[PDB]
C-alpha cells in the first residue's frame, strides 16, 4: 500500500497547532507590516536593522507558513509544491535565520559603539553604508543557505518508487553529508552568532551601569539594551528545540528508530516550528512594550 508515509498525529493536535499558526500569522503579519510603515542618525541606522528583521519575519510568515501548514502538518504526502517549492522552502528558511542572526550581532556591535565610543560613532557610518551592510548580510545569508538547494529535493518513497502519492520533499543526500550540512547551519546561524551576541549583550549591560547631559539619550539606550536583551533571549529559546530536532532527525540510527520516536518526532515538529513563528512575531510585540514613543505611533499607524 501507500500508507507507509502517513504521519499519525491526532486530529485534535492538528487543529490546535493550526489555530496557533493562524493566530501567530495574524499577530506576526500585522505586527511586522505596520512596523515597517512606522520606520518609514543612530536612531535611524538602527531603523535599517529593525527593518531588515521585520522583512525576514514577513517572508517566513507569508511564504513558509502556508506551505508548511499544508504539507508538513496536515497532508504529509505527496508534496504538492514541486521541486522548486521543496528546495526554495528550505533555502528561504535558512537564509532568513542567517539574516536574523547576523542582524542581532550587528546591532550588538553598533549599540556597543553607541555607548563606549559615542564620538567615534558621532561621525557615524553613512545612511548609504548601513544600507550596504544590510544588503551584504542578506547576500551572505543566501550564500550560507546554498547547501539547502542541493541537500533537499523530491523523492518517490512509494513501494516501487512509482506511485505519485509517495512523492515527498526530503533530504536527497547521504546521511553523512546531511549531518555535515545540518551542523554547519546549527553552528553558523545559532551557536556562533548567539554566543557572540550574548557576550556583547553582557558587556553592554555592564557598560551601561558604568555610564550611569543635554538630551534624553540614556533613556533611548536603555530601551536599546533591554529590547536587544529580550530578542537574543527570545531567539535562543525559540530556535533551540528547532536545531535539536534537526540533529535528532539524522543522528538517531535506523536501528534506534522505533514507532514511538517516529510519532514523538512529528509532535515535536509541531512545537519546534510553532516557536519558530513565535520568533517571527515577538519583535513588534517587544518594541511596543518598552518604547513609549514607538507603541503609540505604532497604534496610530495601525488605524491608518
Amino acid at each position: 500500500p501507500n500508507s507507509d508515509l502517513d504521519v499519525n498525529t491526532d486530529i485534535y493536535s492538528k487543529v490546535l497547532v493550526t489555530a496557533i499558526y493562524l493566530a501567530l500569522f495574524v499577530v506576526g503579519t500585522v505586527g511586522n507590516s505596520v512596523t515597517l510603515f512606522t520606520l518609514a542618525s543612530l536612531q535611524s541606522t538602527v531603523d535599517y536593522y529593525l527593518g531588515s528583521l521585520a522583512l525576514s519575519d514577513l517572508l517566513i510568515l507569508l511564504l513558509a507558513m502556508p506551505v508548511e501548514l499544508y504539507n508538513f502538518i496536515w497532508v504529509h504526502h505527496p508534496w504538492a509544491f514541486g521541486d522548486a517549492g521543496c528546495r526554495g522552502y528550505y533555502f528561504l528558511r535558512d537564509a532568513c535565520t542567517y539574516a536574523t542572526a547576523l542582524n542581532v550581532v550587528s546591532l550588538s556591535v553598533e549599540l556597543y559603539l553607541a555607548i563606549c565610543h559615542p564620538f567615534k560613532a558621532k561621525t557615524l557610518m553613512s545612511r548609504s553604508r548601513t544600507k550596504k551592510f544590510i544588503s551584504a548580510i542578506w547576500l551572505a545569508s543566501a550564500l550560507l543557505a546554498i547547501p539547502m538547494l542541493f541537500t533537499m529535493g523530491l523523492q518517490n518513497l512509494s513501494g516501487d518508487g512509482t506511485h505519485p502519492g509517495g512523492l515527498v520533499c526530503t533530504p536527497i543526500v547521504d546521511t553523512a553529508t546531511l549531518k555535515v550540512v545540518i551542523q554547519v547551519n546549527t553552528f553558523m546561524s545559532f551557536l556562533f552568532p548567539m554566543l557572540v551576541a550574548s557576550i556583547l549583550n553582557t558587556v553592554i549591560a555592564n557598560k551601561l551601569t558604568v555610564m550611569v547631559t543635554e538630551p534624553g539619550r540614556v533613556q533611548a539606550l536603555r530601551r536599546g539594551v533591554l529590547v536587544l536583551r529580550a530578542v537574543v533571549i527570545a531567539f535562543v529559546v525559540c530556535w533551540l528545540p528547532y536545531h535539536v530536532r534537526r540533529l535528532m532527525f539524522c543522528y538517531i540510527s535506523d536501528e534506534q528508530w522505533t514507532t514511538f520516536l517516529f510519532d514523538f518526532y512529528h509532535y515535536f515538529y509541531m512545537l519546534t516550528n510553532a516557536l519558530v513563528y513565535v520568533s517571527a512575531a515577538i519583535n513588534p510585540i517587544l518594541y511596543n512594550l518598552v518604547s513609549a514613543n514607538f507603541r503609540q505611533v505604532f497604534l496610530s499607524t495601525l488605524a491608518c
Binding site: 507507509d4 508515509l5 523523492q155 526530503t170 528508530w257 522505533t258 514507532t259 517516529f262 512529528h266
Partner: peptide, 8 residues
C-alpha cells in the same frame, strides 16, 4: 527498528 521520518 522501524520507520524513519522523511520530513525535516
Amino acid at each position: 527498528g522501524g520507520r524513519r521520518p522523511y520530513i525535516l
